[PDB]
Amino acid sequence: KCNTATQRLANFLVHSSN
Amino acid sequence: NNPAIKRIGNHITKSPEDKREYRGLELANGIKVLLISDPTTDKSSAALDVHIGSLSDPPNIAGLSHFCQHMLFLGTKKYPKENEYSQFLSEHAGSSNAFTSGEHTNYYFDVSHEHLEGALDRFAQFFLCPLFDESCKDREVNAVDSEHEKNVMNDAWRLFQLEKATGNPKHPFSKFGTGNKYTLETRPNQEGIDVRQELLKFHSAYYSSNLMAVCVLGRESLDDLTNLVVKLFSEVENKNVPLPEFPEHPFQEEHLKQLYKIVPIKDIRNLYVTFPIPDLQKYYKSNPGHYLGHLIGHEGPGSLLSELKSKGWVNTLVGGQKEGARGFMFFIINVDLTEEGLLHVEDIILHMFQYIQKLRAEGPQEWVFQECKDLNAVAFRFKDKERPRGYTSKIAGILHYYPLEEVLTAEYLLEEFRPDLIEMVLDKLRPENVRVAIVSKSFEGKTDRTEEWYGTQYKQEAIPDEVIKKWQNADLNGKFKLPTKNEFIPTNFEILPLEKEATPYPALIKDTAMSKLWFKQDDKFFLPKACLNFEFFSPFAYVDPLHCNMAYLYLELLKDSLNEYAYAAELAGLSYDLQNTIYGMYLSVKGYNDKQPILLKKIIEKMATFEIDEKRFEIIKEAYMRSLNNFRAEQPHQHAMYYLRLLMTEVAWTKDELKEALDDVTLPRLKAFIPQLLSRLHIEALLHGNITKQAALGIMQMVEDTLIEHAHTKPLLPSQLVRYREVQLPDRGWFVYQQRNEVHNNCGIEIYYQTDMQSTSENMFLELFCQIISEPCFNTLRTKEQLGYIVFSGPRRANGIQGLRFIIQSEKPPHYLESRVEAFLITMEKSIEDMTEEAFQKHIQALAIRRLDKPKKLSAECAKYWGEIISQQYNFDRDNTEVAYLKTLTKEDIIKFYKEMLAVDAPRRHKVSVHVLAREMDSCPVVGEINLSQAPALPQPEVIQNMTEFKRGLPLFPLVKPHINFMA
């Protein structure tokens, strides 16, 4: 598929509640 | 006039479907602002994006930006309290998060619409007067270290940093952005660095108004929002900081024509191909990089994936441009490898260059451009209404790249056809400018290098000039052809008139032995879309480990078979989800309603007449085996959740039982399984969207008839519609289950305090209590005590039962972690006793808003109904019913609830704990004995040796009775 449709990796303050 | 405003942008281009009001503008200090007025929104939201990130971290203090991000929430001069911000949001139905990337630091929150200002005010101080308190710095540094610790064993983060390390070391792109205790505390201490000051310097130097963008959304008018923002942000100082730029690509000559062999943590096989390219950002009106991504990453007939898959070398492929930073980008073509594929990498890459040649030979195609352009226009026009929090965050980020008037359309609408840009990018995708990395355990013991930040083991070799030559001399392969017109492209967008018998909730319009059909015509979003959810019930999908494996393989083989045909539907905004469940199968088809019947019919038909390709069977089976084993590489807290699940559910096969039975599944066995699985069924569906009642009954009957015709499917008996129960823990009992994670060097734990069966009263008692302890839990267990990055608390719902759960991932052993949670529980009891009636009534109000928050889009509302159907509770008016009851609760009710079900000496405490030990930990006790609250003494726990015996020795809870819903 096109990368444009992909999870860039950044650092979040809080983890996901989901 | 207004001196605080430099300029008010012209009309902001929006979709004619979008009823929200917009106004772009720029403050005198240079802050780009986008205001959004939504008089109906239940929650307001705001976000600020500073166009500066880790790439600007000083060389001697890696992670400083990210640490700055964390520290801003910990107090300001105007609001000194460590958690004034968090507590304020929590008490007003709000939330907040933030992330740091190489060039951006994005902060965002949402809250009850009537408290935007209070929230915005506290939020603005982050960029005006942060305290960077000394005590908070010493503590918060642990959260950062904890965050990096969880990523250390993550293959994605390892590969992400390895690419940075393999480029030019002088380039700031080689920096370690996350940071940890060593780089943020230890190291800087060995060099007499006062991190407090460095944080103050960094903030003072880079947090300049000229590099900021803000987006606010609320019920207030555009003028009111304007005065609001001007009043809170015009005071940010403009230090005219030059926007960082990186024109010289991190990959230079010495970095090209390089081959890397990497050892992964999980058992995976991947091939990564990268080409350094210029920054194509400025070309957003034509998007040449995406044009090539669309073709090279295309699936469907004639594509690269097709040939790579037919040769049994690859299963999936991803191609397209990848972001770098202002000044550079990369073009990638990554692919997973089969066993045979691993030994044919050179050939795979040759095919890649052959396909690329085909593109140069055919030249740029305008019809392809027009097609994507038309799809993007349809996508923008009918885009689903977003949730405020994510919307403000996105806008704030993209305000840095596009004109105010185009901030909404920039990423969707295409205007220019650029055969010259397309050819320019294609000219960079050549063998002499390639980088190749292979990820496989087969490299274990053959590597000679180690990435310092993650410890990744790899080898670096130059690609032999003859291999380069062979690729450079690639000719056309007849198996490679450009895609053809996309027949799935929708054309009928008429919104049907709201029928006369239109109901507020889904209605049961078909109740037969074969199927139960819930239906609702959309009455609020008015978009040309629909959601078709089907639940297929069959005992043979989870009867034993073997059949569960087959249920999985079957559906996985089926999706692999429809892929090529289904890809076009995907691009045209029509997708589907098919997976096996513990009760049978789940199928979901969503998107534009126009062509859904066509995709659906195709799926069911293929389902009931499927023919398994032997080659595809062995390949997928081998992957599934690795997939199961790879669970050992998952995080400690994920293992804890997994064990609790197996422990509390009546019937559940473990991953060990699954792979064990996986060698027994043969092609013959699978072929027999499918017809058996479809022989007897029961279907419960929910059709919701732009569809009539007759179209719905029609769609439901078409599915059944297809099954009846090709699989002779017959109805399932009502008593065969079984639902699993949850183990019923004994009063005052406490059990502990212990395990070890052999990959991560961190401990994981989950504590579950089972309350009772779900019901209006039981639900709100549990939910109110969670609402009250939510922020205090995070502030106590993490901010103050810094047990770990991951500290979670909230309700646990399963099989009609519910209770409070705590999840923590830490370096500290589980028995200690438990002591701390028990200490916190007592702190909360006192806290609830000490809070005013108004503070209590405030939490009730906050919980009420969270529960009544309206879904903004069709799929979100469908999800709520689906939840009522899946759980078989069918309480469609649950939110109004439950909130009404909640508004009745008193502080006394909650105190009694805790004393009866939660306190350590509670007469009905039902406690179960899952202890996951770190890799480097042989054993560890199950119980044990400063400015930390005193932890109560705990009783002797019963250690669970065998899961099966544990369940057998305990009674089972009954199932929840369905809520009444009449109709024929």
Coordinates of C-alpha atoms in Angstrom, one line a residue, chain B residues 139-522:
Chain B
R139 CA 10.9 12.9 39.8
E140 CA 9.6 13.3 36.3
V141 CA 12.9 12.3 34.8
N142 CA 11.9 8.7 35.8
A143 CA 8.7 8.8 33.7
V144 CA 10.9 9.6 30.6
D145 CA 13.4 6.9 31.5
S146 CA 10.4 4.6 32.0
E147 CA 9.0 5.5 28.5
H148 CA 12.3 4.7 26.8
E149 CA 12.6 1.5 28.8
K150 CA 9.4 0.1 27.3
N151 CA 10.7 0.9 23.7
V152 CA 14.1 -0.6 24.2
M153 CA 12.9 -4.0 23.2
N154 CA 10.5 -2.8 20.6
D155 CA 11.6 -3.7 17.0
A156 CA 10.0 -0.5 15.6
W157 CA 11.9 1.9 17.9
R158 CA 15.1 -0.1 17.4
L159 CA 14.9 0.2 13.6
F160 CA 13.8 3.8 13.9
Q161 CA 17.0 4.7 15.8
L162 CA 19.3 2.4 13.7
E163 CA 18.5 4.4 10.5
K164 CA 19.5 7.6 12.3
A165 CA 22.7 5.9 13.6
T166 CA 23.6 4.6 10.1
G167 CA 23.4 8.0 8.4
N168 CA 25.8 10.8 8.9
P169 CA 26.7 11.1 12.6
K170 CA 27.4 14.8 12.2
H171 CA 23.8 15.4 11.0
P172 CA 21.4 16.2 13.9
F173 CA 19.2 13.5 12.4
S174 CA 21.4 11.0 14.2
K175 CA 20.2 12.3 17.6
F176 CA 18.4 10.3 20.3
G177 CA 15.1 12.1 20.8
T178 CA 13.5 10.1 23.6
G179 CA 16.2 10.6 26.3
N180 CA 16.5 8.8 29.6
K181 CA 17.7 9.1 33.2
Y182 CA 21.3 8.7 32.0
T183 CA 21.1 11.6 29.4
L184 CA 18.8 13.8 31.5
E185 CA 20.2 13.3 35.0
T186 CA 23.2 11.0 35.5
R187 CA 25.3 12.4 32.6
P188 CA 24.5 16.0 33.0
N189 CA 25.4 15.7 36.7
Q190 CA 28.9 14.4 35.8
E191 CA 29.3 17.6 33.9
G192 CA 28.0 20.1 36.5
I193 CA 24.9 20.9 34.5
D194 CA 21.9 22.3 36.2
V195 CA 19.1 20.7 34.1
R196 CA 16.7 23.2 35.7
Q197 CA 18.6 26.0 34.0
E198 CA 18.9 24.2 30.8
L199 CA 15.2 23.6 30.7
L200 CA 14.7 27.4 31.4
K201 CA 17.2 28.2 28.6
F202 CA 15.7 25.9 26.1
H203 CA 12.2 27.1 26.8
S204 CA 13.3 30.8 26.8
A205 CA 15.3 30.3 23.5
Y206 CA 12.9 28.2 21.4
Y207 CA 9.4 28.7 22.8
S208 CA 9.0 31.8 20.7
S209 CA 5.6 33.0 19.6
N210 CA 6.8 33.2 16.0
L211 CA 7.2 29.4 16.0
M212 CA 3.8 28.7 17.4
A213 CA 0.4 27.7 16.0
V214 CA -2.9 27.5 18.0
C215 CA -6.3 26.0 17.3
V216 CA -9.3 26.4 19.6
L217 CA -12.8 24.9 19.2
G218 CA -15.8 25.8 21.3
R219 CA -19.4 26.8 21.4
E220 CA -18.5 30.5 21.6
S221 CA -18.9 32.7 18.5
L222 CA -15.9 33.5 16.3
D223 CA -15.6 37.0 17.8
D224 CA -15.7 35.6 21.3
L225 CA -13.1 33.0 20.5
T226 CA -10.9 35.7 18.9
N227 CA -10.9 38.0 22.0
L228 CA -10.3 34.9 24.1
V229 CA -7.2 33.8 22.2
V230 CA -5.9 37.3 21.8
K231 CA -6.3 37.9 25.5
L232 CA -4.4 34.7 26.6
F233 CA -1.8 34.3 23.9
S234 CA -0.8 37.8 22.6
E235 CA 1.5 38.0 25.7
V236 CA 3.8 35.3 24.5
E237 CA 7.1 36.9 23.5
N238 CA 8.4 36.9 20.0
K239 CA 12.2 36.3 19.9
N240 CA 12.3 35.8 16.1
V241 CA 13.9 32.4 16.2
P242 CA 14.9 31.1 12.8
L243 CA 13.0 27.9 11.9
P244 CA 15.5 25.1 11.9
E245 CA 16.4 23.6 8.5
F246 CA 18.3 20.6 7.2
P247 CA 18.9 21.0 3.5
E248 CA 21.8 18.5 3.5
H249 CA 20.4 15.0 3.4
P250 CA 21.6 12.7 6.3
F251 CA 22.4 10.0 3.7
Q252 CA 25.4 11.1 1.7
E253 CA 27.5 9.2 -0.8
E254 CA 29.3 7.0 1.8
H255 CA 25.8 6.1 3.1
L256 CA 24.4 4.8 -0.2
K257 CA 24.7 1.4 -1.8
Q258 CA 24.9 -0.1 1.7
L259 CA 23.4 -3.3 3.0
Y260 CA 22.4 -3.8 6.6
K261 CA 21.7 -7.1 8.4
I262 CA 19.7 -6.7 11.6
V263 CA 18.8 -9.1 14.4
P264 CA 15.2 -8.5 15.6
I265 CA 13.6 -9.1 19.0
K266 CA 10.4 -10.8 17.6
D267 CA 10.7 -13.6 15.0
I268 CA 10.1 -11.5 11.9
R269 CA 11.5 -11.3 8.4
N270 CA 11.5 -7.9 6.7
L271 CA 13.2 -6.2 3.8
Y272 CA 13.6 -2.4 3.8
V273 CA 14.6 -0.4 0.7
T274 CA 15.2 3.3 1.1
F275 CA 16.1 6.1 -1.3
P276 CA 17.1 9.6 -0.2
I277 CA 14.9 12.2 -1.8
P278 CA 14.4 16.0 -1.6
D279 CA 11.8 17.5 0.6
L280 CA 8.5 17.3 -1.4
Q281 CA 6.4 19.1 1.2
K282 CA 6.2 22.3 -0.8
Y283 CA 4.6 20.4 -3.7
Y284 CA 1.4 19.5 -1.8
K285 CA -0.8 20.8 -4.6
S286 CA 0.5 17.9 -6.8
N287 CA 2.1 15.4 -4.4
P288 CA 4.5 13.6 -6.8
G289 CA 5.8 11.5 -4.0
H290 CA 2.3 10.1 -3.3
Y291 CA 1.7 9.5 -7.1
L292 CA 4.6 7.1 -7.1
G293 CA 3.5 5.7 -3.7
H294 CA 0.1 5.0 -5.2
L295 CA 1.6 3.0 -8.1
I296 CA 4.5 1.2 -6.5
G297 CA 2.5 0.4 -3.4
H298 CA -0.5 -0.6 -5.4
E299 CA -1.9 -4.0 -4.8
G300 CA -4.5 -5.2 -7.3
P301 CA -3.7 -6.8 -10.7
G302 CA -0.4 -6.2 -12.4
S303 CA 1.2 -4.7 -9.3
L304 CA 4.6 -5.4 -7.7
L305 CA 3.1 -7.0 -4.6
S306 CA 1.2 -9.4 -6.9
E307 CA 4.3 -10.8 -8.5
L308 CA 6.3 -10.9 -5.3
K309 CA 3.4 -12.8 -3.7
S310 CA 2.8 -15.2 -6.6
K311 CA 6.4 -16.2 -6.4
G312 CA 5.8 -16.9 -2.8
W313 CA 8.4 -14.4 -1.7
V314 CA 6.4 -11.7 0.1
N315 CA 3.0 -11.2 1.7
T316 CA 2.6 -7.5 2.2
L317 CA 4.2 -4.4 0.8
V318 CA 4.4 -0.7 1.7
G319 CA 5.7 2.0 -0.7
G320 CA 5.7 5.8 -0.8
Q321 CA 7.4 8.8 0.6
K322 CA 8.4 8.9 4.2
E323 CA 8.9 12.1 6.2
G324 CA 12.3 13.3 7.3
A325 CA 12.4 16.9 8.2
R326 CA 12.5 20.4 6.7
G327 CA 15.0 19.8 4.0
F328 CA 15.0 16.0 3.3
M329 CA 12.8 12.9 2.8
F330 CA 13.1 9.3 1.9
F331 CA 11.2 7.0 -0.5
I332 CA 10.6 3.5 0.8
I333 CA 9.6 0.1 -0.4
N334 CA 9.4 -2.2 2.6
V335 CA 8.2 -5.8 2.5
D336 CA 7.8 -8.8 4.8
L337 CA 9.7 -11.9 3.7
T338 CA 8.7 -15.6 3.5
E339 CA 11.3 -18.3 4.2
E340 CA 11.9 -18.5 0.4
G341 CA 11.8 -14.7 0.2
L342 CA 14.7 -14.4 2.6
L343 CA 16.9 -16.3 0.2
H344 CA 15.8 -14.2 -2.8
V345 CA 16.2 -10.7 -1.6
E346 CA 18.4 -9.8 -4.6
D347 CA 15.7 -11.0 -6.9
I348 CA 13.0 -9.1 -5.0
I349 CA 14.9 -5.9 -5.4
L350 CA 15.3 -6.6 -9.1
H351 CA 11.6 -6.8 -9.5
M352 CA 11.3 -3.5 -7.6
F353 CA 13.6 -1.8 -10.1
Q354 CA 11.8 -3.5 -13.1
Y355 CA 8.5 -2.1 -11.9
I356 CA 10.1 1.3 -11.5
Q357 CA 11.4 1.0 -15.1
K358 CA 7.8 0.3 -16.3
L359 CA 6.9 3.6 -14.8
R360 CA 9.7 5.4 -16.6
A361 CA 8.6 3.6 -19.8
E362 CA 4.9 4.5 -19.5
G363 CA 5.6 8.0 -18.3
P364 CA 3.4 9.9 -15.9
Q365 CA -0.3 9.1 -16.3
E366 CA -2.8 12.0 -15.8
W367 CA -5.8 9.7 -15.5
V368 CA -4.2 8.2 -12.4
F369 CA -3.8 11.8 -11.1
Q370 CA -7.4 12.7 -11.9
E371 CA -8.6 9.5 -10.2
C372 CA -6.8 10.2 -6.9
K373 CA -7.8 13.8 -7.2
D374 CA -11.5 12.9 -7.6
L375 CA -11.4 10.5 -4.7
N376 CA -9.7 13.0 -2.4
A377 CA -12.4 15.6 -3.3
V378 CA -15.1 13.1 -2.4
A379 CA -13.2 12.2 0.8
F380 CA -13.0 15.9 1.8
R381 CA -16.5 16.8 1.0
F382 CA -17.9 13.8 3.0
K383 CA -15.2 13.7 5.7
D384 CA -16.5 12.5 9.0
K385 CA -16.9 15.1 11.7
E386 CA -13.8 14.7 13.9
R387 CA -13.5 14.8 17.7
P388 CA -12.3 18.2 19.0
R389 CA -9.2 16.9 20.8
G390 CA -7.7 15.2 17.8
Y391 CA -8.9 17.9 15.5
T392 CA -7.3 20.9 17.3
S393 CA -4.1 18.9 17.6
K394 CA -3.9 18.2 13.9
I395 CA -4.7 21.7 12.8
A396 CA -2.2 23.3 15.1
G397 CA 0.4 21.1 13.6
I398 CA -0.5 21.7 9.9
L399 CA -0.9 25.5 10.4
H400 CA 2.9 25.6 10.2
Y401 CA 2.8 24.3 6.6
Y402 CA -0.1 25.8 4.8
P403 CA -1.8 29.2 4.3
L404 CA -4.7 30.0 6.8
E405 CA -7.3 29.7 4.1
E406 CA -6.1 26.3 2.9
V407 CA -5.4 24.6 6.3
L408 CA -8.5 22.4 5.8
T409 CA -8.1 21.5 2.1
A410 CA -4.3 21.4 1.9
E411 CA -4.0 17.7 2.6
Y412 CA -7.0 16.7 0.4
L413 CA -7.5 18.8 -2.7
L414 CA -5.1 18.3 -5.6
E415 CA -4.7 21.0 -8.2
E416 CA -1.6 20.6 -10.2
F417 CA -0.6 17.7 -12.5
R418 CA 3.3 17.7 -12.5
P419 CA 4.8 15.2 -14.9
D420 CA 8.1 17.0 -14.3
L421 CA 8.1 16.5 -10.5
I422 CA 7.0 12.9 -10.9
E423 CA 9.9 12.2 -13.3
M424 CA 12.3 14.1 -11.0
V425 CA 11.5 11.8 -8.0
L426 CA 11.5 8.7 -10.2
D427 CA 15.1 9.6 -11.2
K428 CA 16.2 9.3 -7.6
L429 CA 14.9 5.7 -7.3
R430 CA 18.0 4.1 -8.8
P431 CA 20.3 1.3 -7.7
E432 CA 23.2 3.7 -7.0
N433 CA 21.2 5.7 -4.5
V434 CA 19.8 2.7 -2.6
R435 CA 19.9 1.5 1.0
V436 CA 18.9 -2.0 1.9
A437 CA 18.3 -3.5 5.3
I438 CA 17.2 -7.1 6.1
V439 CA 15.7 -8.1 9.4
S440 CA 16.0 -11.8 10.3
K441 CA 17.0 -14.0 13.3
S442 CA 19.2 -15.8 10.8
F443 CA 21.7 -13.0 11.4
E444 CA 22.0 -14.0 15.0
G445 CA 25.6 -14.6 15.8
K446 CA 26.8 -13.1 12.4
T447 CA 26.7 -9.4 13.4
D448 CA 29.7 -7.3 14.3
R449 CA 28.1 -4.0 15.4
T450 CA 25.8 -2.7 18.1
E451 CA 23.6 0.4 18.2
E452 CA 24.4 2.2 21.5
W453 CA 21.0 3.5 22.4
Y454 CA 19.0 0.3 22.0
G455 CA 21.7 -2.4 21.7
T456 CA 20.6 -3.5 18.3
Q457 CA 22.9 -6.1 16.7
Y458 CA 23.7 -5.7 13.0
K459 CA 26.3 -5.9 10.3
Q460 CA 27.0 -3.4 7.5
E461 CA 28.3 -4.3 4.1
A462 CA 28.7 -2.4 0.8
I463 CA 26.6 -3.7 -2.0
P464 CA 28.8 -5.5 -4.5
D465 CA 29.1 -3.4 -7.7
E466 CA 28.0 -6.2 -9.9
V467 CA 24.7 -6.5 -7.9
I468 CA 24.2 -2.8 -8.5
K469 CA 24.9 -3.2 -12.2
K470 CA 22.4 -6.0 -12.5
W471 CA 19.7 -3.9 -10.9
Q472 CA 20.7 -0.9 -13.1
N473 CA 20.2 -3.1 -16.2
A474 CA 16.6 -4.2 -15.3
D475 CA 14.3 -4.6 -18.2
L476 CA 10.5 -4.7 -18.5
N477 CA 8.7 -7.7 -16.9
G478 CA 5.5 -8.6 -18.7
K479 CA 3.9 -9.5 -15.3
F480 CA 4.0 -5.8 -14.4
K481 CA 1.1 -3.6 -15.6
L482 CA -0.3 -0.3 -14.5
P483 CA -3.7 -0.4 -12.6
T484 CA -6.9 0.1 -14.6
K485 CA -9.8 2.4 -13.9
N486 CA -11.1 1.9 -10.4
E487 CA -14.7 0.5 -10.9
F488 CA -15.4 0.8 -7.1
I489 CA -15.3 4.6 -7.3
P490 CA -18.7 5.8 -5.9
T491 CA -21.0 8.0 -7.9
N492 CA -24.4 7.9 -6.1
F493 CA -24.3 10.2 -3.0
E494 CA -28.0 10.9 -2.6
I495 CA -29.1 11.0 1.0
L496 CA -32.4 9.1 1.2
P497 CA -35.4 11.1 2.8
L498 CA -35.8 10.2 6.5
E499 CA -38.5 7.5 6.4
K500 CA -41.7 7.9 8.3
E501 CA -41.1 5.0 10.8
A502 CA -37.6 6.3 11.6
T503 CA -36.7 5.5 15.2
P504 CA -34.1 7.1 17.5
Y505 CA -32.4 3.8 18.3
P506 CA -31.9 0.6 16.3
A507 CA -35.1 -1.4 15.9
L508 CA -35.4 -5.2 15.6
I509 CA -36.9 -5.6 12.1
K510 CA -36.2 -9.3 11.7
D511 CA -36.3 -12.0 14.4
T512 CA -36.0 -15.4 12.8
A513 CA -34.2 -18.6 13.8
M514 CA -31.5 -17.9 11.2
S515 CA -31.0 -14.2 11.9
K516 CA -31.8 -11.3 14.1
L517 CA -31.6 -7.9 12.3
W518 CA -31.2 -4.6 14.1
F519 CA -31.7 -1.5 11.9
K520 CA -31.5 2.3 12.0
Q521 CA -31.6 4.9 9.2
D522 CA -29.1 7.6 9.9

